[PDB]
Each structure stands twice: as structure tokens, then as C-alpha cells.
Symmetry: C2
Subunit: 302 residues, 2 copies
């Protein structure tokens, strides 16, 4: 079976805390003796319309921040702002800190989101960073500071911290250095994303997955150049491939014996001729939120 | 806003998973207090699995034939019994990470989270529903037996599923934590078919309400139906009947959207006898039936 699968969330659950300033409360990430959270925690609701964060933060001291792990307060002993993230040094090193790294992901890459409220994990689900740098998440009031992550061996790579829901109902946030993905700002104002596109490298990974499972009617006898493929794909609102995309498809190419550019020629035929009422892996829709790594991970184990 | 298939955070269950080996057979166990629960076919050789007499095989085993590993630590087995299709190994150490828990038997159409594990190590988490034919559509590979399904309510884990088998059709079968299979299956290495599956109608209606809450409305109509006339059409299409209890449980979603349950039933009836005409609902080309009304209310409250 093929399912959207999240990483086991326990290593991240052990890092979630609550951060409050005044009556504004959201989630933070407690790693070693530092808590990371969205800087708009320092705003009242009226502040968020047009905030001057530097001005607002110079008014705050360590003793204005309430950090709680459950009902246990963690005393704040220093604070600083890095882009759109606040870092609060606390006096206790988190004994559940996993091995971790901060990463900035590419569009197309997937990650698990641990949706949290008041520092308490509520649910986990899988997301892809869209080409327009939004994610199609599920978030309610109080969810900011929830994080997205991948887990490789035993190391947690944090890649996303949640800040905002756009008018269209999709979501926007930052990496853990506080830099937004996309052309968004943490202000209570209506912001639009670019028109989205289909994640071509993931569609190719899905076609490879179909082949591995014996579903291969769409393989044609042609090949293409990468440049010709990119120029055609863009007319169908598909993303162009990069050299890194070609490389990450390498393992599936080797597993199936189907050259990357041959699969591109097959996809191109699918694009210009349609599916003709046929299905691939049970579906009439091409799936674009499974990466090549997701295909390998779900068809091969951990 | 937003709507996503979401699992419970898995940390509380991750702290309970161990590896269980007997001879050349290895799978996963669930370690609660001083007892480890795992599928009994771990006592089988590849020859025994074809037609096993489990009581015979078990009486010929001693405690030392069982190797239980929690991470890098071997747990000493000091007792063993069998409860239906589940083996219970008594160990000399209590699991410090045992959560508050209970064993429950889930009803068809209810959902739960699965923590897929290999060699005692958590690999991924996803949401499943118990199908009306008592299969589940999971994602499981070799080495995954003993993985468990669960729900979390406040701080209590309700374990409802332990994994044993993949049917020839690719769906999955297992037991509750008393070792009783869901459905007419047996833990023998033979090809087994399920009863004809039906669609979980109350869940489809819940998901249609979710679609309206998120702005997807093209499928609505001004028609209404009686409950009985709806059920005549549902049964014609191999949908489960909708009961008055189901109507009542959908009440909160009906109030939140202003759409009477029987008006949504008229919409569903039109979809069943007309199709979607290549359109999508919440990004799906098929009618989704693995969200309960509770799943939708929890995710879409407000």
C-alpha cells in the first residue's frame, strides 16, 4: 500500500513548550537551553496590524516571557531576535533534546508537521513545500510555532516553523533561523502567493513507484533532453527540473533500469495526450507530494 | 483552516516498542509494565507457518528461546503465555515509559493511528480506518508484524490493533490486543480473501462537510431526500446504511455549515449516480471514507 506517512513524532514532542507574552500565547521549540518561537508572540492583537518588532522587543526583558513545559515554568535568562524568530535562553537544558540540525528545504521537499496547541502536541501529518512556498496544512488559532521536520537515522532536521494562514487557506512560515519561505511577512495583512505549479520531480518519483509495482503502460519508447523537457513542462504549469532533481531520482532510475530522461519523455507524453481514462497506481490523478526519498522509504522500510 | 489526514502523536507508543526474536523469526512487540505483547507466529519456523499447531509449538518453547531487545538492552523473559493470537512474554523489568493505557476493540468505520515499526524501531505513523469487511488499508512491509494501532484521549492510549498479515489484494489484517482477529482471517501462511468491502457512508458525509467548511461547494444541490430513500441508493452502490445515530453524530457539522444532514445525503446520492465529472473534492478524485465525524470536528472546530 501507498500512504502519506509521517515520521514518528516522539523526538519532537519532547521539545515542544508554550511561550506567552501578556495574553499572546503560542508554541516554542526547546533544544538544549534555548527555546525558539515566532517573534509575533511579543505583539498584542492590535500590535500585529503594523508591528515594529525592534521597537516592541526593546521594551521587553527576560522577565516578561513565560515559558512552560506543561505546567512547569522555565525561567528565561536571555533573549534575542534572529529574523522572524525569537530565541529565549532558559536555565534548564532539555534532557529530551535529540540529535538535531536546522535545514532550509527546497520546494518539493516533504516534511512531517507536529501541530501543537498550548505547547501540547495534537496531531502529526505530512506536508510538501509547494513551488510557491506555501504548504497545504491544517492549523487553527494557537498553532503558531508548530514545527516541520524530517528524521534521518536518529537526527532530527527541523525545516519549518509555522506563522501564518493566507486568505486562500494555505499556510506560510519560516525556517528555524527565522527566514520566511516565500515573499511573506509576519504582519496582520492580506498577502498573496504566486500561482502554484506541479512538482515535477515528485510526479516522476510516483511514476517510478508505479513501475516498481508492475504498472508500466505509460512507458513510451522515446527520450528527451532535459532542456526540451523543461520548456515543455512549463507550458503545463509543471516545474522545471534541476540537476539536483536528476540526481535524487538516480536510485529509482537504477532500481527500474529506466533512464531519468526516458521517464521524462513518458511524462511528457502523459501531459500532451492525457490519461485517456486510464489510471496509475489506482488514480486518474498524478501525485506530486511523494519525493523520491518518500518512495524509497515507504517501499523499503525506515 | 485546512483539512489533512492526521495521526495522533506517536511518542507515547514509541516508548513501548521492542524487538522480539525466536529462532530465525523477528518482529515487533509492545512492552507495557512488565509484559511484552507480540504476534504468536514469532514462534513459527517458515515450515511451521504453513499449518501451525500453536499450542504444540508453544509448549515446546522455553523462556530462553525468546530474545527481547529494547534498544541496546536485552530484557530477560521470565514467563510466557498465549492469549488467542497474541503471545505474552513476562520480563523482569517494568517499562518506565508505560503510558496510561487500555485495550479496546474498535468498530468498523472507526479510525486509529498506526505506528509502523521494523526490528522494534518506529518507522512511520499514519491514520487508518477499520473497514466494514474488517481489513485495513495500511502500508506494511516484511518485519512489520507487531506494529500497533491506537487512539489517544487526553493522556490515555487505547490500543486497538496489532498487525499480522497482508492479504493477496494488498490490504491488511490483524487482531485486537486480546489476540482476536478482526474479520474471518487466521494466522496461517495461506491466501485469504475478505468479504466484499463497502464504503463508510457516515464518514463520506463527514468529509463532504469538511469540504464545505474549507470552501469546496460545487457538489451541493437544492434537493432533499428521506433517510430511507437515501439508504436505498446507498445500498445499491455498496455503501453502508446511514442510521439515525449517524445522523445525530453529524449534527455539529450540520449546525456549523447550515446544511441539513439529509440535504448532504441528497448531494451524496447525486455524486453516486453521476460521478464527479473529472472534478475533485478536497484534492481527491474519489469519495474519501476514512475521516470520522469526530476527526472532522476536531480538526475543523472554529
Amino acid at each position: 500500500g501507498f500512504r502519506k506517512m509521517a515520521f514518528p513524532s516522539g523526538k519532537v514532542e519532547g521539545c515542544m513548550v508554550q511561550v506567552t507574552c501578556g495574553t499572546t500565547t503560542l508554541n516554542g521549540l526547546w533544544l538544549d537551553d534555548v527555546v525558539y518561537c515566532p517573534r509575533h508572540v511579543i505583539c498584542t492583537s492590535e500590535d500585529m496590524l503594523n508591528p515594529n518588532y525592534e521597537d516592541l522587543l526593546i521594551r521587553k526583558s527576560n522577565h516578561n516571557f513565560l515559558v512552560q513545559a506543561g505546567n512547569v515554568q522555565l525561567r528565561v535568562i536571555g533573549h534575542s531576535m534572529q529574523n522572524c524568530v525569537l530565541k529565549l535562553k532558559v536555565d534548564t537544558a532539555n534532557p529530551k533534546t535529540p540529535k538535531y540540525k536546522f535545514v532550509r528545504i527546497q520546494p518539493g521537499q516533504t516534511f512531517s508537521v507536529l501541530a501543537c496547541y498550548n505547547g501540547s502536541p495534537s496531531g502529526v501529518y505530512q506536508c510538501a513545500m509547494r513551488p510557491n512556498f506555501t504548504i497545504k496544512g491544517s492549523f487553527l488559532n494557537g498553532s503558531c510555532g508548530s514545527v516541520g521536520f524530517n528524521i534521518d537515522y536518529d537526527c532530527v532536521s527541523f525545516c519549518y516553523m509555522h506563522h501564518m494562514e493566507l486568505p486562500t487557506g494555505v499556510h506560510a512560515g519560516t525556517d528555524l533561523e527565522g527566514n520566511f519561505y516565500g515573499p511573506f511577512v509576519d504582519r496582520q495583512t492580506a498577502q498573496a502567493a504566486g500561482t502554484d505549479t506541479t512538482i515535477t520531480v515528485n510526479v516522476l518519483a510516483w511514476l517510478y513507484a508505479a513501475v516498481i509495482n508492475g504498472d508500466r503502460w505509460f512507458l513510451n519508447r522515446f527520450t528527451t533532453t532535459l532542456n526540451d523537457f523543461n520548456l515543455v513542462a512549463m507550458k503545463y504549469n509543471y516545474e522545471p527540473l534541476t540537476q539536483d532533481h536528476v540526481d535524487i531520482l538516480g536510485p529509482l532510475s537504477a532500481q527500474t533500469g529506466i533512464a531519468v530522461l526516458d521517464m521524462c519523455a513518458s511524462l511528457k507524453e502523459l501531459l500532451q495526450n492525457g490519461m485517456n481514462g486510464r489510471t496509475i497506481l489506482g488514480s486518474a490523478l498524478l501525485e506530486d507530494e511523494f519525493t523520491p526519498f518518500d518512495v524509497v522509504r515507504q517501499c523499503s522500510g525506515v
